[PDB]
Design an enzyme around this catalytic site. Structure first.
Site, short mmCIF file in Angstrom:
data_model
loop_
_atom_site.label_atom_id
_atom_site.label_comp_id
_atom_site.label_asym_id
_atom_site.label_seq_id
_atom_site.Cartn_x
_atom_site.Cartn_y
_atom_site.Cartn_z
N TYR A 109 0.82 -1.15 0.00
CA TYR A 109 0.00 0.00 0.00
C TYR A 109 0.89 1.25 0.00
O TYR A 109 1.77 1.36 0.83
CB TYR A 109 -0.94 0.00 1.21
CG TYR A 109 -1.82 1.22 1.30
CD1 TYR A 109 -1.36 2.41 1.86
CD2 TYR A 109 -3.12 1.18 0.85
CE1 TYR A 109 -2.17 3.53 1.95
CE2 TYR A 109 -3.95 2.30 0.91
CZ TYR A 109 -3.47 3.48 1.46
OH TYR A 109 -4.30 4.56 1.54
N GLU A 197 -3.34 7.67 -3.97
CA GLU A 197 -3.40 6.37 -3.33
C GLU A 197 -3.14 5.27 -4.36
O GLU A 197 -3.84 5.21 -5.40
CB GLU A 197 -4.75 6.12 -2.68
CG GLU A 197 -4.82 4.80 -1.94
CD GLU A 197 -6.15 4.62 -1.21
OE1 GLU A 197 -7.13 4.51 -1.89
OE2 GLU A 197 -6.20 4.72 0.04
#
Ligand SMILES: [Cl-]
Lengths: 386, 289
Positions: A109, A197
């Site tokens: 992530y 993101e």
């Protein structure tokens, strides 16, 4: 404003950020042609909607030959894609992204985002790529690096070494990823982003880092200086009524409720929604309209509010400070001309010439306009009419 | 009163714009000592009977003003705040909405380093009742009294002020701190000023959804502020993850919600009001009839 995966990746390519080869497709034939042009023997065929969770929803299929590309594109293009993020109504898929398949060995992530309380940027990284970062933070904080970047200095190698530690990267891998993060930070700053993101960021068997997905959010206040970002807008992904309201100088948000509201100033508009709830009814909307708005703007605000046929009452709550309440009252009367509506309108005007305004509204003899001066009385009158 | 009074010398950045002209005139009529203003390429002119300058630095040298009132468009706000800080301004009141967050982020860091405080952006300004006003608030609503006001909003501030005046009291100074995600002076700094101001006996704080300034203020009040505080936090009914007009008014996580703020304030002894209609009444409870 948000953009699609394919649009984020074209920005990445334009800024020298490593990306898998890929291209957007608007038809099945375009998808096949794209795969042919990309080469290799593996292509991801991906629904392009803003909402996450496309994989579980069935919007991502990995083709191993050009027949599979054709087949998968036919199934995904035009589907109503339901994900956890779309909610049950889903979203019509109108474009595909065709991307070369990578040999993935790790998924991470990575996000860059604004830290409001520290007035600075945060870089968040986790070893748990593909997973819900809020659940990973809660359950396993040692698998997350949250790195505070003071924009005075920007992203530095020492910040990167902290990310590399939590991702378990060796020296050379770490250096390669950190180089990518420096580019992503620069892009974030340059385009007035407020969220970048990458979930997941993949590491390939050959030792490369790529964004397998990308979600970019841009500061709406800065779009005027990024015309190349503004042109990416996808109006099918945005709420039509909010957008229409904004064209007329109104801020509108639809809720589910029985009392519509029309108010000047965001704070007072929220407070108006709050007092309706406190009075035992339910606000149907947020609407901020300037007290100085023209009767045309006010007429458009009425039109938008009244689309919801669950509304039982309209609560106009306007504080005329610099703008005189008597002129606001005249504009409300002008704006209600030729309107055919059976629901009552409670009009609470206070401030400058409040008494004159109430006199004007009472004297119209339009009995379903109910003037009040104090906020408490206004809200009680709304409550009695529901 | 705090921060400003009838003698404070004020320059206006964006002085010759239409809106700025309208408000500057009303501020002067209310008693504000506006000594000059800035518009590039109009230096040497006269406007509303005062000198116009090209640069804040020229204005500060000629007038010795250390307070600025900023009306420039959103694209100019960051650079105008930086200009003010560079010239030695000590307090900049910034009205304009829609300033890019990043511009405000960098401009505030520079202001901090130079010792300039900011009020705003995206705010109606500051008013000391019947003495001076810097901004766009309706002067006549603000009758002099012993209640301080700190608010992230515009019209809701006037609504609160009016309730307090109707309830037999008045306002010492009211400060609109702004509706943006990055702002300048906020609850802690202004509550400390009000605590030291002998004319103020109680403070109303008006907040809204987004970030956690009002949560952090609660403990701070308990530990540092002995004057009574009334709070109203707008947005109890706001949906999560949605901007409610103001760029700053968005609930991203549970501690940014109105309920979380009200609960923190309540548990530290702040007088929390549920209905926005009853702010005046809360002050009457506290101070008496
Ligand atoms: Cl407001």
């Amino acid at each position: 404003m948000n953009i699609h995966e394919y649009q984020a990746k074209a920005i990445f390519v334009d800024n020298g950020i490593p990306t898998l080869k890929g291209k957007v497709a608007f038809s099945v034939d375009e998808a096949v042609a794209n795969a042919k042009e990309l080469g290799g023997s593996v292509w991801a065929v991906k629904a392009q909607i803003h909402a996450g969770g496309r994989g579980l929803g069935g919007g991502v299929k990995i083709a191993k030959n050009l027949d599979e590309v054709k087949d998968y594109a036919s199934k995904i293009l035009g589907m109503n894609l339901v994900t956890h993020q779309t909610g049950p109504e889903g979203k019509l898929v109108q474009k595909l992204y065709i991307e070369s398949g990578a040999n993935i060995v790790k998924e991470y992530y990575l996000a860059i985002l604004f830290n409001r309380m520290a007035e600075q940027i945060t870089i968040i990284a986790s070893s748990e790529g593909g997973m819900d970062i809020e659940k990973v933070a809660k359950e396993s904080p040692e698998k997350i690096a949250k790195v505070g970047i003071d924009p005075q200095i920007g992203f530095k190698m020492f910040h990167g070494l902290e990310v590399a530690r939590v991702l378990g990267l060796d020296k050379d891998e770490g250096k390669k990823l950190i180089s990518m993060i420096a580019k992503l930070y620069k892009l974030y700053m340059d385009k007035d982003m407020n969220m970048l993101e990458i979930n997941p960021l993949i590491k390939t068997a050959e030792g490369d880092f790529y964004a397998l997905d990308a979600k970019c959010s841009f500061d709406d206040s800065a779009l005027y200086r990024h015309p190349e970002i503004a042109e990416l807008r996808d109006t099918t992904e945005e709420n039509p009524a909010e957008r229409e309201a904004a064209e007329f100088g109104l801020s509108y948000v639809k809720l589910d409720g029985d009392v519509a509201c029309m108010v000047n100033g965001a704070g007072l508009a929220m407070a108006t929604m709050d007092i309706i709830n406190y009075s035992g009814a339910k606000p149907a909307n947020f609407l901020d309209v300037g007290g100085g708005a023209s009767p045309e703007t006010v007429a458009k605000a009425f039109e938008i509010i009244l689309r919801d046929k669950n509304v039982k009452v309209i609560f106009i709550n306007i504080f005329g400070g610099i703008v005189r309440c008597d002129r606001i009252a005249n504009g409300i009367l002008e704006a209600t001309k030729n309107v055919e509506v059976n629901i009552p309108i409670v009009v609470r005007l206070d401030g400058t010439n409040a008494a004159e305004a109430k006199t004007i509204l009472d004297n119209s003899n339009l009995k379903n306009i109910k003037a009040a001066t104090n906020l408490k009385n206004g809200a009680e009158l709304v409550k009695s009419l529901v | 009163s705090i921060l400003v009074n009838k003698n404070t010398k004020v320059i206006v950045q964006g002085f010759t714009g239409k809106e700025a002209t309208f408000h500057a005139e009303q501020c002067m009529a209310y008693g504000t000592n506006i000594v000059g203003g800035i518009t590039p390429h109009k230096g040497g002119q006269t406007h509303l009977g005062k000198p116009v300058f090209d640069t804040v630095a020229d204005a500060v040298k000629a007038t010795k003003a250390d307070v600025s009132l900023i009306f420039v468009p959103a694209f100019a706000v960051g650079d105008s705040v930086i200009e003010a800080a560079d010239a030695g301004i000590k307090l900049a009141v910034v009205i304009t909405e829609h300033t890019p967050v990043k511009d405000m982020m960098f401009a505030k860091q520079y202001a901090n380093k130079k010792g300039m405080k900011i009020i705003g952006p995206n705010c109606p300004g500051i008013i000391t009742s019947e003495e001076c006003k810097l901004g766009i608030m309706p002067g006549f609503i603000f009758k002099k009294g012993c209640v301080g006001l700190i608010s992230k909003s515009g019209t809701l501030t006037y609504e609160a002020a009016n309730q307090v005046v109707q309830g037999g009291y008045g306002i010492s100074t009211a400060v609109g701190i702004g509706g943006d995600p990055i702002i300048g002076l906020a609850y802690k700094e202004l509550l400390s000023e009000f605590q030291k101001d002998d004319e103020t006996k109680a403070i109303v704080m008006i907040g809204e959804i987004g970030g956690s300034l009002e949560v952090e203020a609660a403990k701070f009040i308990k530990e540092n502020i002995s004057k009574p505080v009334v709070a109203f936090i707008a947005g109890a009914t706001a949906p999560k993850g949605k901007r409610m007009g103001h760029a700053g008014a968005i609930v991203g996580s549970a501690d940014e919600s109105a309920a979380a703020k009200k609960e923190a304030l309540k548990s530290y002894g702040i007088h929390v009001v549920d209905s926005p209609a009853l702010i005046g009444e809360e002050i009457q409870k506290i101070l008496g009839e």
